[PDB]
Design a protein around this ligand. Structure first.
Ligand code: MG
Ligand code: MG
Ligand code: MG
Ligand code: MG
Ligand code: MG
Ligand code: MG
Ligand code: MG
Ligand code: MG
Ligand code: MG
Ligand code: MG
Ligand code: MG
Ligand code: MG
Ligand code: MG
Ligand code: MG
Ligand code: MG
Ligand code: MG
Ligand code: MG
Ligand code: MG
Ligand code: MG
Ligand code: MG
Ligand code: MG
Ligand code: MG
Ligand code: MG
Ligand code: MG
Ligand code: MG
Lengths: 63, 136, 48, 109, 48, 63
RNA sequence: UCUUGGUGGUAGUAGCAAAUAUUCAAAUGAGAACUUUGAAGACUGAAGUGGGGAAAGGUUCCACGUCAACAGCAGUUGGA
RNA sequence: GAUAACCGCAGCAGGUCUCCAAGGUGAACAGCCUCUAGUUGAUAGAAUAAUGUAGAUAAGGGAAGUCGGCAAAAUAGAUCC
RNA sequence: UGUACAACGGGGUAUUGUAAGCAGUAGAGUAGCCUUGUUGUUACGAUCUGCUGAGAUUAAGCCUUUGUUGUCUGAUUUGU
């Protein structure tokens, strides 16, 4: 019972949820859902997706 | 599977049927592995035998060193790219399929594995664990 | 009740749970409790 | 109780037109206003104003609004009245939004 | 009522997941108490 | 009644199509005796039949 | 597997599903899903579902009256 | 002068010679949308079982299917190399 | 004639991804006014920023409801 963090969106991953990705350089990615997952494969920067955790630190929202 | 494997495996989703060409992840000279058959396969009418991570297959080489080509050799799948479920609920997958050339007992032909190895594969096959670096 | 006594080691295994999922099954829910949703998201525009 | 009555209603046509064929969303929306007036005003004869038919069909056959705002008025059927002595006339109500509005009783004064 | 998922330790010696955690679907059955409102007696006959 | 012959007559009188002839619905009684073309012209004089102006094809976005 | 005519079961069955699509009100009427008018939605989209013609047809054109049959539903409408 | 006036048993998705030809997109008399004009005709209503017909999408594999890659997918314009 | 049911409304939950409007000394710049700034001005300007994880949708087979407005005796048949 460790809660993982989404590699794209910064959401909290509870057990069973989402997919884990192993990129070919063996860097482990973790998605909470298929919305994090598909926008990862689509080559989207999390800094430009307005609801992600990394956007809100970049835009100083909710400090 | 069959003989050579140290331990048993939980059932992993079968990603790789016969005719699947997977990359070859060791330094034997083979560039890919074309699966002709899967060890331990159940006999069902019309069902292609389908390999999975940690399984031992029989394979040929379609690209690579000429002395490795035109022969049937055992191989062991180390990466899968079809999302399978672990017993702790983790669904995971690789970007590619990969396998290493083995003998019938499970000794490596190669000496080094380029990339990650599924932990189910490393636990089932001690020699693959010996030459693997990062394991998932 | 079971119609036979079962001593099969999958029975007789004393089970203690560690966590129970209470996220919304109405979507791909992300929070176990509304306190956790209010803590992650902070304050919203919604009235007081 | 009172027979001649006028109330204003909101109808959620979104949940009534859910999954309907696209060539029949606005035809069915007409038939759901008549079902909605027969449920509320109780009368089987429902006459919809031609301005309401303009409101249903404003955005084409498949572009019915999620919420209409209707002024249904139960009235006295005249001139050799039908099986029922009452009918309901259904009016559009000119609102910028049909959201967030309840059922009110419009008085004739 | 519906299903949800849990996490528990596995107590299965000789399994590969012994003392490790597993993620299991459970079904939840909403069970209020039942009111006893009668009795019925059955006799053994040659027809049943 | 049957004003089908009063719309074809009125289209040929005002010189537009039958898609652009507005017969007065509230004067359906007196339109129905306008069987002749002069009677149709008389109903164009007093606005009982209206020319129904053209549907706009604006060129503003094209420009 | 006669000839001519008549009649059944199948059977109120199969079916009446190409060509985006109809809807509201009023009028007429015994009777309106289908007629007429208005309103609305749409389409052919100028190598047109638009205006004319050749061959062929022959009155089908137009008006009034009419609805038994015909328009494989209907019909107050119609090339009837 | 034809998805009802012709021929095809008939008000048959068939066939039958020709003139005129608006705006945009675009290379275009293409496809798509609109103006003038025209039509809104084709039995309807309700429901959304199976099997169909027509259109789609599909994880991982990628012709192992099959007599045979049949069907589908993939490619697609233009500029430069 | 109810700890009733319905239609709306409220809350939750969820999906998407930050609405419209207003504002800005943000904006590649360009064209004018110059009583020429140097965080001038007028016009035009993809985009960006703030209000704003906003706005929209949310049962049609989601959940919940002290709200609002209604509804609650039509028909047929059955006997040892
Ligand atoms: Mg669910
Ligand atoms: Mg549907
Ligand atoms: Mg005979
Ligand atoms: Mg017969
Ligand atoms: Mg039938
Ligand atoms: Mg049918
Ligand atoms: Mg078209
Ligand atoms: Mg069009
Ligand atoms: Mg006549
Ligand atoms: Mg008939
Ligand atoms: Mg008849
Ligand atoms: Mg005629
Ligand atoms: Mg002949
Ligand atoms: Mg016919
Ligand atoms: Mg053009
Ligand atoms: Mg051009
Ligand atoms: Mg059709
Ligand atoms: Mg596939
Ligand atoms: Mg794929
Ligand atoms: Mg073959
Ligand atoms: Mg075969
Ligand atoms: Mg082909
Ligand atoms: Mg070129
Ligand atoms: Mg924003
Ligand atoms: Mg804005």
């Amino acid at each position: 019972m460790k809660v993982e963090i989404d590699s794209f969106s910064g959401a909290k991953i509870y057990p069973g949820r989402g997919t884990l990705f192993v990129r070919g350089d063996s860097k482990i990615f973790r998605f909470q859902n298929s919305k994090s997952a598909s926008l990862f494969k689509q080559r989207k920067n999390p800094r430009r997706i307005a609801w992600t955790v990394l956007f809100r630190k970049h835009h100083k929202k909710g400090i | 599977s069959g003989n050579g494997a140290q331990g048993t495996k939980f059932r992993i989703s079968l990603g790789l049927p016969v005719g699947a060409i997977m990359n070859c992840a060791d330094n034997s000279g083979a560039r890919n592995l074309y699966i002709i058959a899967v060890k331990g396969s159940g006999s069902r009418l019309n069902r292609l035998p389908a390999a999975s991570l940690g399984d031992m297959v029989m394979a040929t080489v379609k690209k690579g060193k000429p002395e490795l080509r035109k022969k049937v050799m055992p191989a062991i799948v180390v990466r899968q790219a079809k999302s399978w479920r672990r017993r702790d609920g983790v669904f995971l997958y690789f970007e590619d399929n990969a396998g290493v050339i083995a003998n019938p007992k499970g000794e490596m032909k190669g000496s080094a594995i380029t990339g990650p190895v599924g932990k189910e594969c490393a636990d089932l096959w001690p020699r693959v664990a010996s030459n693997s670096g990062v394991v998932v | 009740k079971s119609l036979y006594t079962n001593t099969s080691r999958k029975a007789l295994e004393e089970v203690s749970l560690k966590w129970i999922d209470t996220a919304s099954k109405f979507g791909k829910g992300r929070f176990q409790t509304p306190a956790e949703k209010h803590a992650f998201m902070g304050t919203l525009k919604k009235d007081l | 109780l009172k027979d001649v009555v006028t109330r204003e209603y909101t109808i959620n046509l979104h949940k009534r037109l859910h999954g309907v064929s696209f060539k029949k969303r606005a035809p069915r929306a007409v038939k759901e206003i008549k079902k909605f007036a027969k449920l509320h005003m109780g009368t089987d004869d429902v006459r919809l104003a031609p301005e309401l038919n303009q409101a249903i069909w404003k955005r084409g056959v498949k572009g019915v609004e999620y919420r209409l705002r209707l002024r249904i008025s139960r009235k006295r059927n005249e001139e050799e009245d039908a099986k029922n002595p009452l009918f309901s006339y259904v009016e559009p109500v000119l609102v910028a939004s049909a959201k967030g509005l309840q059922t009110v009783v419009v008085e004739e004064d | 009522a519906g299903m949800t998922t849990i996490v528990r330790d596995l107590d299965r010696p000789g399994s590969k997941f012994h003392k490790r955690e597993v993620v299991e679907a459970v079904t939840v059955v909403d069970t209020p108490p039942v009111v006893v409102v009668g009795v019925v007696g059955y006799v053994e006959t040659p027809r049943g | 009644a049957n004003l089908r012959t009063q719309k074809r007559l009125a289209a040929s009188v005002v010189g537009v199509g039958k898609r652009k002839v507005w017969l007065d619905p509230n004067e359906t009684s007196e339109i129905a005796q306008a069987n002749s073309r002069n009677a149709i012209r008389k109903l164009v004089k007093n606005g009982t039949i209206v020319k129904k102006a053209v549907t706009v094809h604006s060129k503003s976005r094209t420009r």
